[PDB]
From a paper:
Leucine-rich repeat kinase 2 (LRRK2) is an essential regulator in cellular signaling and a major contributor to Parkinson’s disease (PD) pathogenesis. 14-3-3 proteins are critical modulators of LRRK2 activity, yet the structural basis of their interaction has remained unclear.
Here, we report the cryo-EM structure of the full-length monomeric LRRK2 complexed with a 14-3-3 dimer, revealing how phosphorylation sites and GTPase subdomains engage to stabilize LRRK2 in an inactive state. Subsequent 3D reconstruction of the cross-linked particles yielded a 3.96 Å map, with a density corresponding to a LRRK2 monomer and additional density matching a 14-3-3 dimer, confirming LRRK2/14-3-3 complex formation. The complex demonstrated a 1:1 stoichiometry between a LRRK2 monomer and a 14-3-3 dimer, hereafter referred to as the LRRK2:14-3-32 complex. The N-terminal region (residues 1-906), including the ARM and ANK domains, was not observed in the density map, suggesting that they are likely flexible. The elongated LRR domain covered the kinase domain, occluding the active site and thus preventing substrate access to the kinase domain. While the kinase domain was nucleotide free, density within the Roc domain suggested the presence of bound GDP. Our cryo-EM structure of the LRRK2:14-3-32 complex reveals that a 14-3-3 dimer engages LRRK2 at two distinct sets of interfaces: primary interactions occur at pS910 and pS935 motifs, while secondary interactions involve the COR domain. The cryo-EM density map showed substantial densities for the 14-3-3 binding motifs across residues 907–919 and 930–940, each bound to one protomer of the 14-3-3 dimer, with clear density for the phosphate groups at pS910 and pS935. The phosphate groups at S910 and S935 were positioned to interact with the positively charged groove of 14-3-3, including the canonical R57, R132, and Y133 triad as well as K50 within the α-3 helix. Residues from COR-A (1632–1644) and COR-B (1727–1732) interact with both α-9 helices in the 14-3-3 dimer, burying 186 and 278 Å2 of surface areas, respectively, predominantly through Van der Waals interactions.
Residue numbers in the entry:
A (entry chain A): 907 to 919, 930 to 942, 982 to 1457, 1463 to 1637, 1644 to 1659, 1668 to 1718, 1726 to 2027, 2031 to 2397, ...
B (entry chain C): 0 to 236
C (entry chain B): 0 to 239
Amino acid sequence: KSNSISVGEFYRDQRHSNSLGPIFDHEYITSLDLSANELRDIDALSQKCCISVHLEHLEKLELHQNALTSFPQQLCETLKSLTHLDLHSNKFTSFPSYLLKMSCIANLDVSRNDIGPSVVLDPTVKCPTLKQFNLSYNQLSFVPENLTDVVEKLEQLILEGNKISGICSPLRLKELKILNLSKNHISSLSENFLEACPKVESFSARMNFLAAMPFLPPSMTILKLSQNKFSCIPEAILNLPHLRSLDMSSNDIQYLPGPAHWKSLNLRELLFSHNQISILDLSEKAYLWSRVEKLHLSHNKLKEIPPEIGCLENLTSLDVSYNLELRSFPNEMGKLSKIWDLPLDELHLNFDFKHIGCKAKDIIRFLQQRLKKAVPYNRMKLMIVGNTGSGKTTLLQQLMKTKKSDLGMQSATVGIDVKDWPIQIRDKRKRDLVLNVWDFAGREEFYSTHPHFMTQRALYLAVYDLSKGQAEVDAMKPWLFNIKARASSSPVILVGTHLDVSKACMSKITKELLNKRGFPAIRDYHFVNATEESDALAKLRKTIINESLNFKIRDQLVVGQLIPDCYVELEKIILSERKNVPIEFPVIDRKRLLQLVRENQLQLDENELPHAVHFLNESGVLLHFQDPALQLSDLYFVEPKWLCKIMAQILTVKVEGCPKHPKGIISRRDVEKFLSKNYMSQYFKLLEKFQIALVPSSLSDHRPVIELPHCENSEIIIRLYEMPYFPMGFWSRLINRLLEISPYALRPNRMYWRQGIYLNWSPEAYCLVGSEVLDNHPESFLKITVPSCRKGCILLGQVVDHIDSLMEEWFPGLLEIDICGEGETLLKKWALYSFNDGEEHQKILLDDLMKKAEEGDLLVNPDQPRLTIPISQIAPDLILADLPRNIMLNNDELEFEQAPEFLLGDGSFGSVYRAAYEGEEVAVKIFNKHTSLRLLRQELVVLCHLHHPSLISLLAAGIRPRMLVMELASKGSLDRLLQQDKASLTRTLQHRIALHVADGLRYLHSAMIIYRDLKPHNVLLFTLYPNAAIIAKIADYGIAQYCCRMTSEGTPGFRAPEVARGNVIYNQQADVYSFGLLLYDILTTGGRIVEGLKFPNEFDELEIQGKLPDPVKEYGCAPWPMVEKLIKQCLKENPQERPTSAQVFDILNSAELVCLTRRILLPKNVIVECMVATHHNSRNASIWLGCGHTDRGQLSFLDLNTEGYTSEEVADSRILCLALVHLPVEKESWIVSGTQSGTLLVINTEDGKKRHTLEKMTDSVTCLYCNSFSKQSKQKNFLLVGTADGKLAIFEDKTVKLKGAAPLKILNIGNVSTPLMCLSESTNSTERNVMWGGCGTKIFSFSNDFTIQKLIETRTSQLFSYAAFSDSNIITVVVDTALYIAKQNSPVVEVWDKKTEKLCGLIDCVHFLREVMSGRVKTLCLQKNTALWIGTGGGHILLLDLSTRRLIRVIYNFCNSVRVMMTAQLGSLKNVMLVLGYNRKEIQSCLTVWDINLPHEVQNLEKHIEVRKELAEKMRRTSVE
Amino acid sequence: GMVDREQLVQKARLAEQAERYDDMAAAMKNVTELNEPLSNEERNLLSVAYKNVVGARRSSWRVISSIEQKTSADGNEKKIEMVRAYREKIEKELEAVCQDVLSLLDNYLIKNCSETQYESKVFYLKMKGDYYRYLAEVATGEKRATVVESSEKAYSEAHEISKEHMQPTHPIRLGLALNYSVFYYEIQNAPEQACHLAKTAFDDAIAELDTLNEDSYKDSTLIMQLLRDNLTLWTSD
Amino acid sequence: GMVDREQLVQKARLAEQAERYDDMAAAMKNVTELNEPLSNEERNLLSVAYKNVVGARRSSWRVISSIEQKTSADGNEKKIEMVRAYREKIEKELEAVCQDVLSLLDNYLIKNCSETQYESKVFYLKMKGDYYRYLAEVATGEKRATVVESSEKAYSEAHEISKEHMQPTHPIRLGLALNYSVFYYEIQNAPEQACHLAKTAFDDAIAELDTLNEDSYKDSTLIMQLLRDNLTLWTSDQQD
Ligand SMILES: Nc1nc2c(ncn2[C@@H]2O[C@H](COP(=O)(O)OP(=O)(O)O)[C@@H](O)[C@H]2O)c(=O)[nH]1
């Protein structure tokens, strides 16, 4: 409605109760798995029982994880074709040596057994078939002696983690591929150790004591030798002509030979971490490692990175972190754009990194731009700060040599009054440093916005006002404390401002108390007059300049920092624009900035802007806020001197006509101020998103009188935060950060006391974050009290986490243990407790640091140990007790042992172990020192309410030490199974895995959490039995790791186009793209990963765009291109165009998708109405179609393996139907056809010229049937011709060859007005294949006698609902226990009986169709004995179970009109049914292929959904209770 | 069943969509005069319609009484007399509406309540108590005493039925408690009694929130917020 | 039983403090029937009282009309019948109030306005155009044609007097412009004319904002931003 105004209305422009408010609501089996069952003995199966003959063809068995001992000799000789003998963790003692006697065995896995000290091989067996002799993790003392003379074709001998001490045999074996001596106690290797193995490629010796390589053969490809004791790499590695990678971490080396000493052209990965390297020689020949991709130099004594590192363009993952003395990156690596990861841990550079981006790729761009042209930068921040009034404006106006000073009496400073002033030094140095002066607001009213503008790179000033000497300086301590809190390493120059007025002894107090006690590095002080120019002013100027130039944070000399000239140019253009921006609204939109950079010749892109703007923000030209919570990234604030001046307006003036709200609380009101300079409210709400202002500033400074329901000193617990002075930006920001703290409903009673909240829900739970001052203690305390109840513990945990997070985020100066002096850390977080339960008369302090040091026990006691108080009742933050009580550690029953590495099996050298908990096997995850207690609890508090069946669920967690307990993935991560267990994939479990991960994605998205990192390495499996309730599981640890510390960039191989580029923010569409990538890979069964492991840069740059190749063409696999359409939908470059997770899960939820193999779009504008499949040539079956687009006949040959459609005109009149007749003799399959002219045409299969038409039949042929009658005691077949008169031209199988075949029994059944249009065959063979055909409207049948057996009429029906639905020509007939008949344009199907000949049923398609949304029967097709399919005239398929329940499912939205309906069998995937539908937008006969196996699946999967929904709704009661 | 009830109720519905509260008031009045027990939807529609028409007048009475008290100190006979006439006119409109709703309740709605129909009788006693205190807001003298006596009696009967027969967490029972408490505080001027019944209703509801259906969860809590809000406001001195 | 002018206007003041607009409308009926020229305050009271009483019924009317349009698709005879009857009842109520208003302006206010009382005659022509618009909002056919012609004639007269003697920043003239443009956009279905008139008034008031007193300044703005919102809404759905 348009805005209409009454100008009279224009001129015209206590709660006290709360009563009822009208709420008014509204073929022997092969793989047998016997791992999970505890089998102490397998001797039962060794006998001659009924299953002793079936075991001969096993080829696959898993007897691991049980307690077998001394595998029987009878069983190993029972079967002689086994090739995948896998069993570990069985309690054998020594190798049987009789398990190698069978004929052909490989993959012999024994990976955990307690094999004896010696495993000597009996030389009486000569089996070479062994291919994996896995001797992982045994108590071995010597390598098996008879390997050379027994197993010759051995490839993978893995014996890692053993105790083989003595030097081993020369190992005269010739067929090795991969060697592993990891975790062995080896002294050295003999010079003939590897001289007889010219084929090794992956020798790996880890955690040993080795010295040198004994003549490594040139065949080497991969060498892993980390965790050793060296002094230099011996030359035997330095001459391998085919070495590809070398892991040399955890070593003690000194020198890396340069490129001219490796003699290799295929070095890719170079791991040299944890060592002591001083030089990184690259000068001699920089291009000689042109293909090195990985280079890790972490925890080494690197001096500087040589400039020649700009030449190895293939470097992808560089690591120079933990150096602590690098201090510089050469500008030459900016050419090396292939980096996606570059850790910057524990080292300081010439620039500040990790602001919001710095994801290791903007760093490369920054360095490249600096390489383009590097110029010095001279911009410091001089943040003058005072208190309530001092020489700030009078001192700044004379420090600037401003001669005018037009305002004779300058009023009080509001905002910060940002000003910039150049200083050209008239000395040898031409450096003309320009620095901005921010005269902050003296008055305490504005004190809640200043901390935003205290950056670590500044040169603060403070001003005494000496007139109140020795007393006002005491009031200045909060300012210097805030300076220390915000910028620890920022020099401060205190200055006096009053010498004409009077007390100069303030120097003594400043040097005695204010100098160096928990205060910033006060570097110099002055006593300037600050009224007229004098030698004191000149000295202050010289001091301020000399201190600015010698800043040197981390010894870097900020006053002369080096940046690309593009930075200088953009600073210049924004400075020029500053004088050309509207005064009423100086904000610049993103489009304006892009237009500005387009107008000039700048060299940045849309991706160099985010880092440019942030650096320039750090140097005080424009303030921009990239935080997604503050939806104001579009706005850019040039000339901040306006934005600060406007943000401080509200804190000064507030006017209310009536006190509708208490002081400090303001209703949402808009003030126009400037009019039409566009007016935009996002800054009006920015005024609150800054947390400035509900104005906590000037909000009831006095605390209201408040009484707790329970104060008996036992049911309550207190914590204290003794700190010298509350920072300005603390209490308002703490109050707003608390916001709402939810005890895991109705909003609490919220009180807003200037320093205090006291929000409560009941006498059971409350939270008083107060502020009290104790007598005889100048310091300030933050007293926080909560009840001892469980809700109280949760509340305390959340608030302590919040306050600690605020202090860690905004005030790093406080929470920083000062090693110099003593660890005061300015934050003595106390904990109060009382031994006497009630009326203790005293609360005893105990520092939280020493209490958390008391983590070795759970119970804290004093020197008198008879009376004790639990820790969890005194500080439920140290004990992880604040979370739901079902996730306690309960360490008593945790059968765990960290020391063994055979329990480390989960993950290669990972931190996730295996242990026993509550009686079942679980996978425990050991936490390292990286994760702090706050971080760990932040992760687990959000992980404690995910709870989804296809997601790993936390089971236990605790202290002493810090671990996490989750469910054990018995089958492990999906990547291994898709890379070496592809035979387990059988075209169906891919679907279930996709379903489970899609369900997880949908549930997470419904929780407004996206995975952002979804790789086959993150799909944890639990079983390979497809018909299982819980199969696939995605790790929820990734989202916890992302949200805890902000691999957010994702794996380069599996990454969305919008994420790797990084220009646009991320969304659920990235997760959809990764899910589509998982679909592509699971269809390729790890085909793309193999190709990508040898070519990673191309592996990423090919999938970055939507140009992934056809899976069927590139990789040998089942096409199944339906899910390829889903992928292409999820592969789309446009994010919003990709379907959401809910839609893809639902379309996956349909049981028809796994079954629908594919869809064929036959070329433009063609009509076909007939089809016949080929079953005899089951190796490859092609589809033969007809033609309807032409009035004449034209055969339409169409293949399926090539999808090659061909057209061949063969009849002068349109062909209506086809048939296939096959002859066992002569090995051929003739193809017969019938047309409207009655020309029965016969054509050979492979010959397109041997065509001989049969007798010209008088009328239009409507049907052709090939039957099975063996009545002559031999394999025999006939032929049946359905025509427009009911005349049956029945022929023989072998008579079709001769021209004009003579019919055997010409049976004219119908009349001219009663034609024949359908035939069908009996569902069983015990009735001699009685054949039932439909002529006109009545149904009739014969046998081998070929006489009319029945004459059932359908028009004479006693249940007349409509006439023409029964008074019409027949269309389809099926022979089963009952008869289903469909008429022309008959949306109702009739159920007849064979014996009684009565209408037992009348099923109406519309009777089900109208319940889900034209619509009529178009075609019919019945299964063997389970289901019936009705082909609706539209694009809906209904599944009809003829047994008990009519409707099974309606499958719509796939096409628009279903024209054909018949089954087939194709390429070892027999029994697949075929449809050809239309999708009108021009007729496109969309030929679509659907396997028929699903009648069990269509109900089994929904049984897997109904059981899915119940536990998707059952164990959500954990979240409730 | 001689006059079309469905037409009347649909008219009331299109009125509540059209904020024509007088028309729904008349239609609800008629359908209740039809002498057959009202459904929950019709009952609550009657409640909201009459509550709205009485509440606009209550607000008018409050503002005019406030201006009367603020202007009586100025000693202007014309101003005082005019405001007094206007406030008595507001009061007489309130009295017309209130006698109408009271006759509608006692003559029709309570009379046809069966012995086992706890919810209806509780609701109608709640309504009569609410309207009786509405009069007490404008009644003075012996009339004031008579109305508050009737309100206390009706409230006592409603509270006794609800507490004897149904659970605390039922929305009607807690609304009954809210109205009882506000009657004790604002009309009786007995803050301690109001706080006592309010806290009793509060903790009685809390004692059984664990097994409350999610459908009734918001129905209970959206008004439990009101109980706790007035409890906080009352104990603030 | 108070009859004289002062008691009437003070009763109107009490009513506007009491949110009871019918009594206010009666009080202004009597005040105008005293046949004395109305000062700015009494004129404002009459305007707001009758604007509220017409707006309540107008809200009821568009709500009921939307309900009728939605229910017409379903096609139930009884519900459409009662909906039409109630809509007719509201229409008759609107017709009664608007006829009373227009009779009052025709017979009392425009008649006793001198040739030099330009602001008063413009203000009266302004509401008369507004109330003929309100009539047209429920009128269809020949009655609609008559009322739109009447409102157009009144609006053209008011606009001409406004141009000839008011300065463009006068709030009365701006409100006249807004209601004229609303008439053009909603009744005349000629958004180009309304946009042109609104932009002309906008630019003219830009021409004079340099020398506006703050008291008149905010009065100009608090109509101007609404005018600009109307322009932006009308210019955000052009030919696309
Ligand atoms: N008489 C006198 N006044 C001084 C002297 N030094 C500073 N002032 C006064 O200090 C005031 C400075 O205001 P200022 O503190 O900068 O305002 P603020 O920035 O809002 O805190 C001026 O008005 C001066 O008159 C001095 O030596 N003598």
